[PDB]
Amino acid sequence: KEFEQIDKSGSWAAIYQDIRHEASDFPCRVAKLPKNKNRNRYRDVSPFDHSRIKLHQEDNDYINASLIKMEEAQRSYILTQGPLPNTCGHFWEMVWEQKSRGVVMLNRVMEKGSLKCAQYWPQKEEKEMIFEDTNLKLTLISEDIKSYYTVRQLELENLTTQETREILHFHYTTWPDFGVPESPASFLNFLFKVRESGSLSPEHGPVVVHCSAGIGRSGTFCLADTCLLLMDKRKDPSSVDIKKVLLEMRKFRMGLIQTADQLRFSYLAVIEGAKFIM
């Protein structure tokens, strides 16, 4: 309906232009500190200080991650940048401290002939990783390589307390180099797979979602998710405004959704998903 009205008038880019300017702006002083210069993958994508995830590290608690707490939907997510060669230890520290269950990678390690993030997880179960700096060990238990994604069951063990924890890695591997998925069907399906695992359920810490910047594609995941959740707990699609929900998330992290193209997709995914989870 609203989507149809926008489409016929092609007002999408303007709608987005508007969102982009309505969005909240908050300090990122910690992020901009010189001592954190190398803990950041991009200069233009930083975590607002008010919502940044602080490492329980007395040394330096900086990790480019933000907690998006969605009150009404009763769902929290942790959006982060793809781990840098020097920050995989911190990434796994965060996952441990925030008692996260799932990890959502919405990118490939190399896209457009460029390396968009670090290989922070073990590829072969025979060769586990040990993050010295953070004193954590990571092991591949299994994985299910599928057509448009892959589920990996990792095990994170706190080497300090010898305590083990099962982590789930949901890897979406078919998000186009340019554009957005031609159809939501696979994305929604990936979203639902994430949901079924319980990694998105309240009995756990917030899910750690990420791409490269950890805002474009990761933002779409969360928006689609939350919109579908509210629409569900109200069973009243009518009151669920994608534009308002997005802006609401923007109070917690910048540039969620990078292009008006992705915004259109979010509408598609949410609308399509309503024909089930609502």
Curated annotation (Swiss-Prot):
Positions of modified residues (Cysteine persulfide): C211
Cross-link (N,N-(cysteine-1,S-diyl)serine (Cys-Ser)): C211-S212
Modified residues (Cysteine sulfenic acid (-SOH)): C211
Topology in the lipid bilayer: Peripheral membrane protein
Residues forming the catalytic site: C211 (phosphocysteine intermediate)
Catalytic activity entry: O-phospho-L-tyrosyl-[protein] + H2O = L-tyrosyl-[protein] + phosphate
Entry-annotated residues carrying Cysteine sulfinic acid (-SO2H): C211
Expressing tissues: Expressed in keratinocytes (at protein level).
Subcellular location per the Swiss-Prot or TrEMBL entry: Endoplasmic reticulum membrane
Post-translation changes: Oxidized on Cys-211; the Cys-SOH formed in response to redox signaling reacts with the alpha-amido of the following residue to form a sulfenamide cross-link, triggering a conformational change that inhibits substrate binding and activity. The active site can be restored by reduction. Ser-46 is the major site of phosphorylation as compared to Ser-238 and Ser-239. Activated by phosphorylation at Ser-46.
Naturally occurring in which organism (per UniProt): Homo sapiens
Domain of life per record: Eukaryota
EC number: 3.1.3.48
Keywords assigned: Acetylation, Endoplasmic reticulum, Hydrolase, Membrane, Oxidation, Phosphoprotein, Protein phosphatase, S-nitrosylation
UniProt family annotation: Belongs to the protein-tyrosine phosphatase family. Non-receptor class 1 subfamily.
GO molecular function, one term: protein phosphatase 2A binding
Main subcellular localisation: endoplasmic reticulum
Effect upon mutating S46 to A/D: No phosphorylation
GO cellular component assignments: cytoplasm; cytoplasmic side of endoplasmic reticulum membrane; cytosol; early endosome; endoplasmic reticulum; endosome lumen; glutamatergic synapse; mitochondrial crista
Description of how the protein assembles with itself and partners: Interacts with EPHA3 (phosphorylated); dephosphorylates EPHA3 and may regulate its trafficking and function. Interacts with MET. Interacts with NCK1.
Protein name per UniProt: Tyrosine-protein phosphatase non-receptor type 1
Residues bound to substrate: D177, C211, S212, A213, G214, I215, G216, R217, Q258
BP GO annotations: actin cytoskeleton organization; cellular response to angiotensin; cellular response to fibroblast growth factor stimulus; cellular response to hypoxia; cellular response to nerve growth factor stimulus; cellular response to nitric oxide; cellular response to platelet-derived growth factor stimulus; cellular response to unfolded protein
